[PDB]
Every structure is written in C-alpha cells, then in structure tokens.
C-alpha cells in the first residue's frame with residue numbers, strides 16, 4: 001500500500017481549499033522515484049465545476065480521501081505485475097485541481113475554486129526531497145489522461161525546479177499515457193457546454209483563464225499570449241521539451257473519440273473518419289523516438305493491473321520502458337530491445353493483444 005501524506009504547506013490546495021497531497025511507498029536502497037499524476041478530465045467554468053463538485057468530489061477535495069491506496073500496474077511493487085520498476089519509490093499524486101495540472105491560482109474572494117495543479121506538483125517534489133528524493137538518480141514523472149498531458153506540461157518545470165534547488169544529478173524524465181490528443185474536427189458538431197463532448201480547443205482556451213493556467217516556457221514563447229492552449233496538445237508541446245519523454249497513446253483513444261463526438265455496422269463516413277484519426281495520430285508520433293501506440297479502442301494503460309498484456313510488434317510496454325532506460329544509460333539502437341513501437345494497422349483491435 002501507498003500511504004497518504006497531506007501537504008505540509010496547506011496553502012497548496014485542491015479545488016475546494018482542502019490540502020492537496022500524495023500517496024507514498026518508499027523503497028530503501030532504490031534511487032528511482034516514480035511520481036504518477038492521476039487523470040480525470042477537467043472543469044472550466046463555475047457551472048461545470050459545481051456539477052463536478054457534487055458527483056466527482058474526490059477530484060476536487062481531499063476531505064474524503066482514504067489513508068492508503070494500493071499501487072497497481074506501474075505503481076505495483078510486485079515484479080509479476082510490474083516487470084519495469086517494481087522496486088522503485090512509488091508516489092501517486094491525486095488529481096484534485098481539475099485543471100490538467102496547469103493551474104496556479106488560489107481560492108479567494110474572487111475565485112470559488114483554487115486551480116493549483118502546477119503548484120501541487122512543485123510542492124510534492126519539494127516535500128519528497130526531505131523523504132529521500134534528494135538521493136534519487138531518476139525521477140520519472142508519469143501520468144494518465146489529463147495526468148499524461150500534465151506530464152507534458154510539467155516535466156521540464158520539475159527539471160528546472162530540481163536544478164535551481166541544487167540537485168543537478170537527478171535525471172528527470174516523463175511518461176505521458178493517454179495524454180496525447182489531437183485538436184481535430186469532430187465527426188459531428190456538438191455545442192460544447194458539457195465537458196466530455198466539447199471540442200478540446202475551446203474547453204482549454206476557457207480553462208486557462210479560469211485556472212490561471214501555465215504552460216512550458218519554450219512553448220509559451222512560440223505560441224504567445226492568447227494562444228497557450230496550443231501547448232496542451234502533445235504534438236505541439238513535445239518538440240519544445242528538453243527532458244526525455246516516453247509517449248503511450250492508443251491510436252483510437254476513447255476520450256479522443258468522445259471529444260470528437262464518435263459513439264460506437266459502421267458506414268463509410270465514420271469508417272474513413274476513424275481510419276484518418278489513426279493515421280493522423282501515427283503521423284504525429286513518427287518522430288517521437290520513445291513511444292508505444294497500439295491500434296486499439298481503449299483508454300489509459302499504465303496503472304491497470306494487466307498493463308503487461310498488450311504488445312506492439314511483439315514487445316510489451318514494460319519491456320519498451322526497460323529498453324528506454326537502457327537507451328538513456330551513459331551512451332544507437334539496442335539489439336532486440338526497441339523503444340519506438342507504433343502500430344501501422346488501420347482499425348481498432350487489428351492488434352490481437354488489445355484489451356478486451
């Protein structure tokens with residue numbers, strides 16, 4: 001089990017002003033640290049955040065969090081479930097800021113909610129340094145869905161934070177799972193309003209100002225004021241990052257299909273739409289050297305217990321991540337240990353290993 005620690009700096013809060021926190025299982029003698037950012041969509045105005053507060057309150061408040069959580073998938077300490085990093089120090093950071101980990105705003109007489117995702121990550125890192133992270137050799141910032149996008153938005157800031165704090169030997173890396181979205185046209189137009197079926201460009205443009213959202217500096221400098229929403233789209237932000245980032249993305253991600261207003265005999269227009277989506281996402285990954293992109297209709301991968309099962313070209317994700325670790329040793333591709341694994345077949349579940 002991972003044990004809850006509420007942040008000692010209680011000014012760094014969940015949406016409702018309760019303290020944010022993290023769940024930790026230490027592994028003495030390991031100098032690897034895995035910090036995982038939970039996902040769960042976002043909210044971008046008072047009305048939709050109020051609805052989320054009624055029926056998704058654990059994503060906005062720590063008041064009802066349990067004292068422990070079981071680490072699963074890449075957070076498991078059992079080698080059978082986690083061939084990759086079972087002996088690492090494990091950290092699960094609950095998502096309670098509803099801001100894709102981008103916010104830096106407190107609750108105030110002018111803000112019903114605090115959006116502090118970017119500061120939560122910073123404060124978790126700061127407090128972990130006193131609990132053994134100061135001795136780390138690798139800090140892998142991982143996350144799923146909005147947490148995967150949160151990795152892209154925050155990995156270089158964590159790297160900069162550690163350098164400025166005097167820890168230049170900690171190698172900061174990112175693992176972004178199911179957080180690589182396309183700002184494409186919907187299959188059928190929806191009128192936003194709700195969160196899941198809203199086109200993501202407009203939801204994020206609204207959220208940035210509502211949240212006081214921050215993006216990585218190089219990407220901000222490219223897109224400039226009013227256009228920072230672009231940095232929430234992996235294919236646009238990734239080339240600006242300096243930290244190594246491994247991208248895991250289903251080619252037919254269910255959340256991508258949801259925001260595209262696709263709901264699954266498929267007729268020609270939808271067939272072409274789906275095939276074109278897979279081709280576009282494959283294209284965006286062509287120059288991403290560390291990636292795992294199976295041709296499946298599914299959503300998230302890394303913290304589920306059976307994450308070991310899917311393979312691309314005969315290689316599982318735990319194996320690909322291990323090959324990535326080897327590629328980042330003091331050092332040319334590795335014999336039989338690939339790191340770029342993108343399916344080329346054009347329809348969901350054309351890979352027989354896709355989740356059932």
Ligand SMILES: *[C@@H]1O[C@H](CO)[C@@H](O)[C@H](O)[C@H]1NC(C)=O
Pocket residue numbers: 009011012119123
């Ligand atoms: C608490 O966090 C806030 C926001 O990051 C920061 O401005 C402040 O310095 C922190 N205070 C302490 C005592 O860590």
